[PDB]
Amino acid sequence: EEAFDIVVIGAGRMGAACAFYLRQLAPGRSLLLVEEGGLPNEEGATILAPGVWTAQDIPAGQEAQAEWTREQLLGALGSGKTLEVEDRPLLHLLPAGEGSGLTPTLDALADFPEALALLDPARLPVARVDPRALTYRPGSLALLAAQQAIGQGAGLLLNTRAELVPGGVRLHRLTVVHETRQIRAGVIIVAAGAAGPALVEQGLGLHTRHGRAYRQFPRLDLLSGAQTPVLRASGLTLRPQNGGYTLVPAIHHRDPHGYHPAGGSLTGVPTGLRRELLEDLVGLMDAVPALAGEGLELGRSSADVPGAWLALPGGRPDAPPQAEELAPGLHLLLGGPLADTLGLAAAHELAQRVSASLE
């Protein structure tokens, strides 16, 4: 039936960015953007991502991708548009102070008292400061990218679930009855986030080693400022936002295929946080007293706690964003836990390659 040169599945930060770069790299190549949710999609990972760009999230060898992504952020993708991005130093609080060029927490939080009251200076005396860290809303980044892509002639299909079939895509909708509709495509970019691996598996039998982890983002209602630095401890992050802090748990491991997030087992009372997060908090309460006061919103059940599924490339919690061609014309785009520092770069790199194999 109808056909497109390029079909991008997924309108989150990754797919939206990739569709944008492809519209500027290959404007003569028709592109269709398919998203099963809306635009934006508050049921996705991109919306809850803390949006922290930090030199501490750059794996060895990825300095080029990290800086290019940073430049894009401050330049709003070079679209003459507005993208709220503030300069906010990031501190990696540490116990026994001894090693590389660290900084005494006492001095680091000199003009930031609202961040001091959260911890215990004695149990976290030193830190690794990153003066170039930045904060932004991934949701705004993604929307901006989608908008610009659409303003550039990108086909748009929302509230549509894409299914991969040999040669093209099958689109499912709802009018009440289903509406299946196939379409040919020369190139298909799978930017379904954490759902990307399964998509290609159940659709084309293409096996991968990628995994997925469910991460919650409970809020900490304690005084915060527009310039109060991002803080990290034992892998946990305190992202100042909306006058408070958003707690970004560490991912210790991938979650199994058959797993339903439940959480709730704190000192004899059922909460909305997973057992693992609960344990982490208990282990950080002394160092970060704020985790033991009235600030943290624990909720009653997992339903009251903001959460999302993030892809884990290769199943590694610390693996960066990446792309790969699993078959002729078929690419799998993965963002992941480091997408805030390396996300755009991986979408642009994929766009360049796709654009070339078309010229």
Ligand X SMILES: Nc1ncnc2c1ncn2[C@@H]1O[C@H](COP(=O)(O)OP(=O)(O)O)[C@@H](O)[C@H]1O
Calpha distance 11→100 (Å, rounded): 41
Per-residue tokens: 77:
């993708």
Looking up tokens 């401890």 gives 233
Q: What 3-state class would DSSP assign to 296? A: strand
Region of 87-95, 185-193, 217-225, 258-266 interacting with ligand X (CB under 6 A): 185-193
- For 149, the enclosing helix (H) or strand (E) is helix 138-150
> Dihedrals φ, ψ of 329, to 5°?
75, 0
Largest distance between two CA atoms of the chain = 68
Give which of ligand X, its own copies, none residue 96 binds (C-beta under 5 to 8 Å, depending on kind): none
Nearer to ligand X, 102 or 326 (CB): 326
Give which of its own copies, ligand X, none residue 52 binds (C-beta under 5 to 8 Å, depending on kind): none
Per-residue tokens: 245:
């802090």
List the beta bridge partners of residue 214: 309
Calpha distance 59→66 (Å, rounded): 9
Q: Which of 4, 7, 12, 281 binds ligand X (CB under 6 A)?
A: 12
Region of 142-150, 268-276, 286-294, 327-335 interacting with its own copies (CB under 8 A): 142-150
Give which of ligand X, its own copies, none residue 293 binds (C-beta under 5 to 8 Å, depending on kind): none
Amino acid, res. 339: A
Give which of its own copies, ligand X, none residue 193 binds (C-beta under 5 to 8 Å, depending on kind): ligand X
CA distances from 183 to 9, 18, 213 (A): 13, 20, 32
Residues 198-237 that bind ligand X (CB under 6 A): 199
Q: How many CB atoms lie within 10 A of CB 264?
A: 18
Site track 175-194 with its own copies (rule: CB under 8 A), x = hit: -x------------------
Is residue 36 a contact residue for ligand X (CB under 6 A)?
A: yes
Euclidean distance between the first and final Cα of the chain, in Å? Answer: 24
Nearer to ligand X, 124 or 342 (CB): 342
Is residue 140 a contact residue for ligand X (CB under 6 A)?
A: no
Q: Is 46 annotated as a binding residue?
A: yes
- 229: preceding bond cis by omega (within 30 degrees): no
Site track 98-137 with its own copies (rule: CB under 8 A), x = hit: ----------------------------------------
Is residue 45 a contact residue for ligand X (CB under 6 A)?
A: yes
Q: What residues contact residue 254 under an 8 Å CB cut-off, 6+ apart?
A: 211, 212, 213, 312, 315, 317
Q: How many CB atoms lie within 10 A of CB 113?
A: 11
> Dihedrals φ, ψ of 195, to 5°?
-85, 0
- Please answer whether residues 287 and 124 qualify as being in contact, where contact means their C-beta atoms are separated by less than 8 angstroms: yes
CB of 335 to ligand X, least distance (A): 3
Is residue 10 a contact residue for ligand X (CB under 6 A)?
A: yes
Q: Is 162 annotated as a binding residue?
A: yes
Q: Which of 25, 39, 55, 278 binds its own copies (CB under 8 A)?
A: 39
CB of 75 to its own copies, least distance (A): 17
Is residue 173 a contact residue for its own copies (CB under 8 A)?
A: yes
CB of 275 to ligand X, least distance (A): 24
List residues binding its own copies (CB under 8 A): 38-39, 147-148, 150-153, 156-159, 173-174, 176
Which chain residues interact with ligand X by CB under 6 A? 9-15, 34-37, 41, 44-46, 161-162, 191-195, 199, 335
Known binding-site positions: 14, 35, 41, 45-46, 162
